[PDB]
Structures are given as structure tokens and as C-alpha cells.
């Protein structure tokens with residue numbers, strides 16, 4: 001939890017009571033565990049929705065959906081049960097409550113089970129399952145000079161009639177919402193990303209939506225891959241971005257421009273960025289994933305536990321900020337090494353809040369945190385992005401010519417640097433350095449082991465540059481200070497840790513020729529360069545094809561396959577001005593300035609503009 005931030009235990013395990021209704025009688029009952037937080041703002045009223053697991057935190061036990069609400073931004077709350085289970089058995093339950101806010105209404109989607117003690121995806125059929133929608137109506141009043149609010153919950157309605165018996169290539173079994181908070185699309189549709197099973201017990205995600213305020217429901221034709229559960233979605237630039245949990249694998253993210261009719265993996269932005277554990281080989285988690293506007297910039301906030309402990313412990317709840325280009329690690333929301341899996345982040349009246357789980361010995365509470373420090377950090381970072389984007393866009397390029405493009409600009413290494421790091425102007429991913437001397441807008445390297453390393457898969461659990469495996473443009477200005485003994489590296493994308501296995505790179509040789517390297521293709525030296533002269537270098541990769549440009553012109557060999565149509569590359573890092581490896585035999589004596597990383601292949605005009613504007617883009621004077 002960041003400095004300045006604070007929290008309270010709002011839903012207190014084995015302490016907090018809820019009004020338990022049974023057989024026409026209501027009694028204040030102590031709840032064992034509270035899980036699956038959903039925190040929203042309804043017309044000024046804060047509402048926290050969750051599971052009230054009365055007797056145990058076991059998934060298949062007695063559960064009602066509880067709600068707490070506040071009209072004073074979380075200082076005091078009123079408590080109620082929003083949805084009660086069927087009361088058919090000692091393990092009847094309404095589960096995975098998923099919330100949509102529209103106007104003054106709360107739409108809550110829950111699975112309902114009567115008596116099964118087995119985990120839902122293990123069920124061979126749907127005999128024990130129903131899917132329900134309850135609507136809560138929020139009213140505000142001022143009886144007494146003070147703001148008050150009340151929420152009237154309606155009876156749940158089964159949506160089972162809207163679940164087709166078959167979907168493309170399968171027979172349906174059950175479905176549930178993805179928990180947390182879903183959305184109202186810009187066209188007014190209620191949209192729930194849902195997790196669905198078929199009769200083969202496979203799980204996948206779908207879009208489940210309503211065009212008539214929840215009276216009838218439809219499924220989008222498309223789907224995620226199998227294995228994608230607990231989806232959470234938001235709308236961004238006209239598309240739904242569906243962010244899925246994949247147990248024991250990296251999280252898959254999809255985009256859909258047609259209400260789920262077609263799904264495309266977001267390989268160029270967010271897919272496979274977030275891992276569920278350091279080695280991405282443990283169970284995943286529910287995630288808060290929202291689009292908000294902070295100081296005029298539309299951005300996305302995403303949470304997920306780091307899970308250093310493994311299994312479902314899911315310690316270290318972390319918060320991420322992204323504009324669909326850069327991906328910033330705001331930091332750890334939870335405290336110390338506590339288990340803290342599920343969460344819900346709310347941005348209301350320029351204040352940031354998070355309702356999240358804490359778990360000790362499988363007894364769960366929900367803490368309500370005021371994320372003061374986090375918002376401060378977020379605002380600073382967004383200012384930096386807006387500022388550098390503004391700076392680059394404002395440059396009068398030589399004939400003013402076309403503007404330098406910032407669309408897809410993810411990283412920028414320029415003037416800022418410490419003894420051992422080259423700092424990302426966008427503040428997301430620094431490069432490590434060796435044998436580097438600071439110069440205006442860059443670094444001058446020399447000696448065996450010299451260079452800088454801008455990590456890709458080397459980022460570890462969370463891989464912000466995963467997009468580079470699909471497409472990228474890497475740009476830099478370079479100057480060679482000594483003729484090498486053989487062939488020496490200048491810039492490239494490495495597939496392994498050494499730099500010996502390259503995806504695409506540029507070297508230079510003793511005969512004053514360039515050596516562009518295209519994957520494992522035999523190298524053909526070409527062109528010519530002279531010592532002390534500055535050159536503009538661009539490496540592009542898209543559709544498995546690599547190109548290398550010098551001074552805005554493509555070199556011989558460009559347009560070559562760098563990826564066997566077989567697999568998808570797993571780039572380790574970009575190397576700059578050397579390999580940064582004392583064990584590699586080369587000595588690169590060169591200066592590199594203004595390294596730009598884009599998440600797409602730049603077009604000819606964009607490359608020319610960068611070439612012509614080399615002397616104008618540095619961060620030095622700012």
C-alpha cells in the first residue's frame with residue numbers, strides 16, 4: 001500500500017454480521033468469510049458487493065450475495081443481503097456475483113446451485129445450476145438535512161431461457177459471470193463477459209449482452225480459446241477488451257468490435273503480458289479491469305496478485321496502469337506478504353479506492369483501501385506521457401513536414417541515465433548498461449561487455465513488451481568510433497540471453513560494411529559507412545518479416561523471413577551499442593542516441609520523418 005494510502009477491514013471475517021433471512025425470519029448472522037469484491041459508484045452512492053460465505057470459505061458451501069453501501073465515501077456503511085440463495089440445502093449458494101451499474105440501477109448476475117459439493121466445471125450436466133439476474137434500485141434522499149440512501153433489491157429472475165443448448169462445435173453445460181464489475185457499452189448495451197462450460201468440461205469465455213435493459217439476453221457468436229475463465233471486460237476505442245484468467249498460463253486478452261461476434265487476440269498490446277505467478281505455472285485470478293479518465297486522459301487500470309507463494313494463495317496484489325501502449329507497474333496495493341487475491345478498483349470524484357481480499361488460513365476478509373499514494377503516482381506518470389507525447393508531436397519537422405508519430409510509441413531511451421541504467425522517458429521499462437558514458441541524448445559504449453539491454457521476456461513474470469514478438473519498430477541514431485576487428489553488434493532483438501541467437505539486428509564490420517542480420521539467414525554484408533558519421537537506424541518486424549533501414553533507406557536483404565512460419569518468437573531483449581555481455585567476444589565502440597520502440601511496423605513516411613528529425617527529438621533540454 002503506497003505512502004499516504006490507508007485501509008480498514010470493511011467486511012470482517014468471523015465478525016461482520018449480515019441479515020440472514022430464512023423461513024420468513026431475519027437474524028443478524030456472523031459470516032465466516034467474505035470473497036469476490038465488486039466496488040462501484042451508483043449516482044454518488046458507493047456500493048460494495050461480495051460473497052457472504054457463512055460457514056466456510058469453501059467454494060461449494062452456503063453463500064448469499066451481500067451489499068454494503070455508503071453516502072460518505074466509505075466512512076460509514078449500511079449492510080444488506082442483495083440476493084439470497086435457494087435455501088434448498090446446507091450448501092445452496094449464489095456465486096460469482098458480477099455487477100453492472102446503469103443509471104440508478106445495480107444489475108447483479110449470479111450462478112445458483114442447490115446442493116452440489118463439487119466444483120462447477122467438474123459437473124457432467126446442469127442439474128444443479130441456474131443463472132440469475134437481480135436488480136437493485138438506488139434512491140437518494142435528505143430526510144433530516146443529511147444525505148441518505150436506500151437500495152431496494154428485486155427478486156432474482158432466471159436467464160436460463162437465453163442459454164442455447166449448442167454453440168459452434170459443442171453442447172453447452174453451464175455459465176457464470178466473471179465476477180467483479182462489468183459494463184454498459186457506449187450504445188447502452190448491458191455487457192457481461194461470461195465463462196461457459198460445455199459437455200466435455202472445457203471452459204471458455206463469451207460475451208453475454210442485453211439491448212433492452214436486461215429483459216432479454218444474447219450471446220456473441222465468437223469465443224476465447226479453451227482454458228480462458230473468469231473474464232473481465234471494458235470498452236476501449238469502440239471495442240470490447242476481454243481480459244481472461246488462464247490457470248497455469250499467461251493471461252490471454254482479446255478484442256471484439258462486434259459484441260463478441262468475432263474475437264481477435266490482442267497480441268499487439270495486452271495479451272500474454274500478465275503472468276499469474278513468477279513462472280506463470282500456478283492458478284490465475286480474478287482481476288479488476290476498468291477504463292477511466294484521469295486528468296483528461298483515458299486509461300485502463302488492472303489488478304492481479306503476483307502469487308510468489310503459489311497455488312491459490314495469491315499474495316501481493318499489484319496495480320497496473322496502461323494507455324494501451326505503455327504499461328506501468330503502479331505497485332503493490334496489498335501489505336507485506338499477505339495473501340490477497342481478488343480485488344475491485346473504483347475511481348470516484350477524483351479519488352481512487354480498492355476493495356480487496358486478505359486471506360489467512362483460508363479465512364477471508366475484504367479491506368477497503370483509500371489509494372491516495374497510488375493516484376498520486378498515476379497522475380505523475382500520466383503527466384510524463386502527455387508531456388513527452390506533446391513534445392514529440394510539437395516538433396516542426398524539416399520540410400513544417402509531417403509530425404513525428406507517437407501512435408504506438410511505447411518506450412524511449414534518451415538523455416536520462418544513471419551509472420547503470422538508461423531511463424525510459426515513459427517510465428515503464430529501463431535498460432541496464434555496462435561500460436557506458438553519458439552523452440547528450442544517449443550513451444557512448446566501449447570494451448568487451450559494453451552495451452545496454454532493454455528487457456523483453458527478461459522482464460520476467462510481467463512482460464510489457466510481449467507485443468514485439470508480433471510486430472515492432474526499433475529506431476536509433478548511431479555513430480561508430482573505431483573499426484572493429486571482425487563484425488560487431490550495434491542494435492537488435494535477441495531471441496536468447498547471450499545475443500548469439502538473433503531475431504533481427506544490425507552489426508558493422510572491418511570492411512566498413514553494414515551487416516544486417518535476418519533471423520538465422522546467412523549474413524550478407526552490404527553498403528558502406530565511415531567512422532564518426534551519425535547514421536539513422538530502423539529495424540522493423542511484422543508478419544514474420546524483418547527489414548533494416550539506414551538513413552531512411554532499406555538495406556539489401558530486407559524483406560526476409562525472421563520467424564519460421566512454425567512458432568511465435570520469444571524475444572529475450574533488445575541489445576543496444578553492444579551485447580552487454582562480458583562473455584561475448586565483441587567490442588563495440590559506438591554512441592547510440594534516442595532509441596524509440598513502437599508496437600507496430602512504421603510506414604515509409606513515418607520512417608523518413610524520424611530520419612529527418614533526428615537532431616530534434618532528444619529529451620536533453622527538458
Ligand SMILES: CC(=O)N[C@H]1[C@H]([C@H](O)[C@H](O)CO)OC(C(=O)O)=C[C@@H]1O
Nearest residue numbers: 059095096119120176229230285312
Ligand atoms: C463457482 C466457483 O467455484 N467460483 C470460484 C472461482 C472459479 O474457480 C472460477 O475460476 C471463476 O469463477 O474461482 C475462485 C477462486 O478463488 O480461484 C473463487 C470462486 O469461488
